[PDB]
Amino acid sequence: ETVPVKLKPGMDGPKVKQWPLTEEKIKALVEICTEMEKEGKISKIGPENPYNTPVFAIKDSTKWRKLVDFRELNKRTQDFWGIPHPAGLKKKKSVTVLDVGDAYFSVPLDEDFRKYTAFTIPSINNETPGIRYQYNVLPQGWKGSPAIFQSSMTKILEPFRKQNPDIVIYQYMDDLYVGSDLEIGQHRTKIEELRQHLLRWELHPDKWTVQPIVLPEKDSWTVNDIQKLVGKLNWASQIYPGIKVRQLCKLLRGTKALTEVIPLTEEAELELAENREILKEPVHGVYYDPSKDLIAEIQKQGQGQWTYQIYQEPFKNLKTGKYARMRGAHTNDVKQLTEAVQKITTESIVIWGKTPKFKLPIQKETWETWWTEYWQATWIPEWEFVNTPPLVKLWYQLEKEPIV
Amino acid sequence: SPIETVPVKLKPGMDGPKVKQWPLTEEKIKALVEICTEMEKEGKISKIGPENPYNTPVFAIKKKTKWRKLVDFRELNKRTQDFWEVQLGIPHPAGLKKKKSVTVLDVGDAYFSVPLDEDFRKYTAFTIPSINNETPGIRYQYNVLPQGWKGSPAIFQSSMTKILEPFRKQNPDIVIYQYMDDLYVGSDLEIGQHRTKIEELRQHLLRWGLTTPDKKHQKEPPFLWMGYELHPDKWTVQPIVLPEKDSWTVNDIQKLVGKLNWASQIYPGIKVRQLCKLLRGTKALTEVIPLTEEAELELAENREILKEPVHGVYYDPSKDLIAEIQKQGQGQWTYQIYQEPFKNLKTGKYARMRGAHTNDVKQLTEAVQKITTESIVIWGKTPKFKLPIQKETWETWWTEYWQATWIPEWEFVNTPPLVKLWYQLEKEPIVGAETFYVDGAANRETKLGKAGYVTNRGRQKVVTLTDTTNQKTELQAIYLALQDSGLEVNIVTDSQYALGIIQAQPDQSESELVNQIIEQLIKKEKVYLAWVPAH
Ligand SMILES: CC(C)c1c(OC#CC2CC2)c2cc(F)ccc2[nH]c1=O
C-alpha cells in the first residue's frame, strides 16, 4: 500500500530547471526512462504539472545510471520523527558501501505526491519538447524513500545481522555501509554473502588519523623565515590562545634584509618550543552538536594537493585532513575537487551519519558546468562557493605528513 | 477536435474574474454580434446565461479593415494556475542539421482547435453590450483554447506533441520542430518523397481538426529566424540597415548602439566607442546630440562592414567540433565555432567584463566556460579548443592558482596577441635586492593620511595625502616602494589586501591605484612581496 506523504507546512514543490546535458547523457536517460516507463515506475505528464527537478546520468561502471537531484524536494518533504547513527561504525577496520537504491521501485508512491517528483529530459538545441515524467514508485535520491522502506529494509537484514553480529550495517539514502573487523578476504567474502542475501529479493575508518600542525625547524633563520612563522602562529592563536609570538616578534625589530640571518634568543627558542607543545594536540572542548549544521571547507594547496576541515563552529574543528589527486586527475582541478567532495562526505556520513554543507574554492559556473562528469555517489551534498583566505591555506598546508 | 482536455485549475484558492463589460457603440456591438454567432456555430464558444458570475471585457478593433474582436484575459490569467514553462530555449541556427528539404506548415486556428477543460470554461465568460446599457447583453464562454489566455500555448503544444508521437516514430528519417503555430519539417528524402510525406502529415493533422493550409499563405524559403535567413543548405544573416539622418536623438543613438552591439557578434570589426560617447550627460531621450567627426566616421566604417554578406553552415554530426578564441584587447574576446575551415556555424564575442580584479588567463578561462556551456546546449558536445596561450603558460598559472579552474581538451594556436602572465612574484625573498618596509596610515574620517617606506639600505620617504582612505595609503606605500626601487625589490607589508595580490597576482583591477601598482610590478625584473601581521 501507499503511505500519505506531504510537504512541510506551506511548502510548494520544487521547480528547479534542467541543466543542459551531453548527447551521450541524454541518449542513455531516454533509454533508461522508456524502460521504467514500460515497467510502470514512471509515467509521462502534462503541462498542468508545473514542478521540476534536475536529472543527469553518471557511470566503476560503464552502463549509465540515472541520477536525480532531489535536494530541493527533500528539503521540502515533511519529516518522519530513520536510523540512529551507530557510534561503532567509525571504529571498524574496514567498511564497504552498497547501492540498495534499486529496492525502492518495488514500493508505490502516494499518488497525491507524485506530481512533485516531476523531472525533464532536455533535447539538444531544443529541437524537441523535453520529455516530462513523474514517479509512481519510491524515487532513488529522495529522503522519503529509505524511510518508507525502513520496515521492509530492517526485516530483510536481521537474518544476516544475527548470523554476523560483529558486523555493523548502516543506511544513508540509497547506500548501505557495512563495517567489520574481519580480515580483507573474510570481510569481502562475508559482504558478498550479504549481497547474495540481498539479491534474492573499501573504506578503513580506524586509519583516519587526526593530523597535527608541524612548525618548520632550521639550522639558521632569516628575517623572512621568522616573519612567515609569526604570521602563521598569530593566525593560529585563534585556535590555541596559549600560542605566543612576543619574543619572536622582538627579533623582528629593525629594517633589515629579508634574507639576513637572525640568531634566536633563548627566550624566543623557548616560546617556539612552548608553541610546538601546544600544537601537539587538538584543541579541547570540541564536541559534535547533532542539532547544528556540519560544515566542510576546502582549500586548494597546489600540485594536486587539497586540505579540508569539518567543523560546526569557527576554529573548533571536528576533523581536518589532506587529499592528494587520484591517479588520472593530473590536469583537472574539477575532477580532484568533486572526487574530494565525495570522499569527505562519505567520511562525514560514516562518522556522524549526515552530509556536511560545503564551501568550495571554485567559481559557481566552473563547478556547475562540470561536476557531474566526475560524480559517482548516489547522494549530493549542499555547497557554496568561496574565496580562500590566503592564511587559512598557509596554516593547514603546515599539517604533518608520514615519515615515509 | 477529439483531443483529451488538459485539467486546469485556478491559482491557490482564488476566484474567476468578475470585471465589468466596457461600454461600446451600436456599431462595435453589431460587429461582435456577427463574429460571435459564427464562433458560436464553429463550436468555439457557447451561449450561456445567468448561471455564471464570471466575466471578462470584450473589445472591438478593426485590423489592416473588417471589424474583429479582442477579449482581455489579463485578469483571468493572473488568476490561472501555473504551467510548466513554454519553450524559452529555442533552437539556434548553428545547431540545426542541413536538410534535403524543409517545409513550414502554418497550423491555422491552432488555439481554437483544441478543447478547453470543460470545468474551467466558466471563467472565460464574457459579454456583448447592448446599445448604451439597455437590457441584458449577449453572454458566452469558450470551449476551446482562447487567444490570449495564460494556459493556451502550453496546452496547445502538448496536444501537438501527443498528435505527432505516431507519425514521428513512423518517420524517423523525418524531423519536425513545433514552435508557436508553426511546424518546421525537414528531411533527407527526395523532393517528391518529401512532398508526399508532408501531405501525409498535413492529412494526419486534419484527422484531429487541424486545418493547416497549402497554396495561399504557404511560406517559402529562406526562413526568417531571429536575425537569420535559413536555407536548407546553409544560413545567411538578415542584412542589417543603419539609417542616415541629419538629426539624431538620444533614443536614436541608443537603439542604434543596440543594433550595432548585436552586429558585433556576427560581424567582425564593429565598434561603438564614439557612439556611446554621445550619451554622456544627456538630459532627455528626445534630446538631439550632434555626432562628432569621430562618430560620423565609425558610423561610416560600420555601414561598410555591415554591407558584407555573412553566410554560414549547419551542424554535421560526423565532423569534429572546433572553437578558436582571440583576445581582442583587454577583457575582450572573440570566438568562432566551425567544423571545416572558414565555414563557421556560429561566431560571437564577450564584452569587456570590467571586474574588481582578475587576470587574462582567468578571463580566458571564463570565455572558455561560457562557450562550453553554449556548445553543450547547441550541440550536446563541447568543442576541441584552439587557444592563444602556450601550454606552458597555462600549466604554470593553473597549477598554482588558489582557485579550482580548468579548460577542456584544447590546443595552442599562435595567433597573436597571445595571452600571457604579465609578471610573477618571487617564490622566495630576493638576495641582494633592496628591502622596503612599507606603511600607509590614514584617518578614515578626516581622509587624511600618510604613506612611506624605509629601506634596510637607508633610503626613506613619506608623503601626505588628503581625501584618501586607509587601503589607498597602504597601496600607495607599496606604489612608492615600487617606484623608488631598482629592477629587483623586496617589499614587506601588513596590508591584508596586498596578501590578496600575492595569492591572485591580478593584471587588471577596478582601482586605478591597484592598476598603477600592476604597471610597476610588470616593470620590475624581480619582486618578492611579503605580508606580516600589523601592530
Ligand atoms: C527539424 C529541425 C530541427 C530542422 C529545421 O527546422 C527548424 C527550425 C527552427 C528555426 C530553428 C531546419 C530548418 C532550416 F531552415 C534549415 C535546417 C534545418 N534543420 C533541422 O534539423
UniProtKB/Swiss-Prot annotation, chain A:
Phenotype upon changing residue 49 to D: Confers resistance to stavudine
Summarize the impact of residue 89 to I.
Answer: Confers resistance to nevirapine and efavirenz
Please give the annotated consequence of changing residue 60 to S. Answer: Confers multi-NRTI resistance
Effect in UniProt of substituting residue 134 to M: Confers both multi-NRTI and multi-NNRTI resistance
Site positions (Essential for RT p66/p51 heterodimerization) are 370, 383
* Outcome, altering residue 92 to R: Confers resistance to emivirine and trovirdine
What happens after mutating residue 90 to P?
Confers resistance to TMC125
Give the source species: Human immunodeficiency virus type 1 group M subtype B (isolate HXB2)
Q: What, per the annotation, is the impact of changing residue 67 to V? A: Confers resistance to abacavir, didanosine, HBY 097 and zalcitabine
Name of the protein = p51 RT
Q: What is the effect of changing residue 39 to A?
A: Confers resistance to lamivudine
Consequence recorded when altering residue 207 to T: Confers resistance to atevirdine and zidovudine
Q: Where does Mg(2+) 1 bind?
A: 99, 174-175
Note the effect listed for residue 68 to L.
Confers resistance to HBY 097
Q: What is the effect of changing residue 203 to A?
A: Complete loss of RT dimerization
Effect noted on mutating residue 179 to C: Confers resistance to efavirenz and nevirapine
What's the reported outcome of changing residue 124 to L? Confers resistance to delavirdine, efavirenz and nevirapine
Which consequence is recorded for altering residue 302 to E? Confers resistance to abacavir, lamivudine and zidovudine
Please give the annotated consequence of changing residue 67 to I: Confers resistance to HBY 097
* Annotated ranges, domain Reverse transcriptase: 39-203
What changing residue 95 to I does, per the record, is:
Confers resistance to HBY 097
Effect of mutating residue 173 to I = Confers resistance to lamivudine and emtricitabine
Span(s) of short sequence motif Tryptophan repeat motif: 367-383
* Effect noted on mutating residue 62 to G: Confers resistance to didanosine, zalcitabine and zidovudine
